[PDB]
Design a protein around this ligand. Structure first.
Ligand SMILES: O=P(O)(O)OC[C@H]1O[C@@H](n2cnc3c(NC4CCCC4)ncnc32)[C@H](O)[C@@H]1O
Ligand SMILES: O=P(O)(O)OC[C@H]1O[C@@H](n2cnc3c(NC4CCCC4)ncnc32)[C@H](O)[C@@H]1O
Lengths: 130, 125
């Protein structure tokens, strides 16, 4: 089973520690294809990621930090019909993009509010139901 | 003929005045098309499917602008991305790496140059 994890890089690395926790937890549920997010130029990066996205069985995104790449990955993922879980922290004090919040089906595309400490329990809840 | 314009909102409205200028200039080249959030998403995707060209100002990081570009690429839309390196920011590798120089172009520009960059692209067309 393949999992594609999305999180901000050039959008900012403020949530890196949280990304590492998410990736560690995701390894219980499959192979994390994009593990370097939590640590040939741009063309290669893009194509390598697109190939991984096509292979992935599920896409998990932490969407608290605004990022073009995370948004782009989610857009491509929806077009591929992938099951998507977005995780957002309201305590950040920001309001989540209407385009992400509004993409929610509440089934194939889920957007869940969580508190920083609960990330592991949220992922367990999703992958128990998956 | 019809144009979808993308720019950061909840990502930050720092460049809002610039966006307005982009939109004014786009009017010469086509019709600019652009629960609560569910409706906004549905409306925008409808416009995106109808669009003949997609233009995005990608200087301010934004999930929504990224998502629009992802959806637009999957639909094979011609895409122009405009980026300001004098902002001090480095552009997303996923956006820059998506470019192919034809159906997906990324153009670096300086403050005051945006209209001429638009004129060139739409004169291609
Ligand atoms: O850099 P932004 O915040 O626009 O996008 C981050 C998202 O887009 C993908 N991404 C962005 N830059 C990446 C990247 N960059 C290289 C590794 C560090 C410097 C260049 N490598 C792999 N994936 C990348 C990641 O999977 C991540 O989820
Ligand atoms: O809000 P972010 O920065 O994630 O995304 C902005 C992009 O996504 C679309 N968008 C986001 N919020 C929108 C919106 N209303 C939101 C609901 C209250 C104000 C913002 N109305 C129309 N389009 C919107 C725009 O076309 C814009 O290009």
């Amino acid at each position: 089973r393949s999992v594609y994890f999305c999180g901000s890089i050039r959008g900012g690395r403020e949530d890196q520690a949280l990304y590492a926790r998410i990736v560690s937890r995701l390894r219980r549920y499959g192979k994390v294809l994009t593990e370097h997010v939590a640590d040939g130029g741009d063309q290669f990066i893009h194509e390598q990621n697109l190939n991984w996205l096509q292979q992935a069985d599920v896409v998990v995104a932490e969407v608290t930090q605004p990022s073009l790449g995370v948004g782009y990955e989610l857009g491509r993922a929806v077009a591929l019909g992938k099951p998507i879980l977005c995780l957002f922290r309201p305590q950040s004090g920001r309001v989540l993009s209407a385009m992400i919040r509004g993409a929610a089906d509440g089934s194939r595309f889920q957007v869940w509010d969580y508190a920083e400490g609960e990330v592991e329990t949220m992922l367990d809840r999703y992958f128990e139901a998956y």
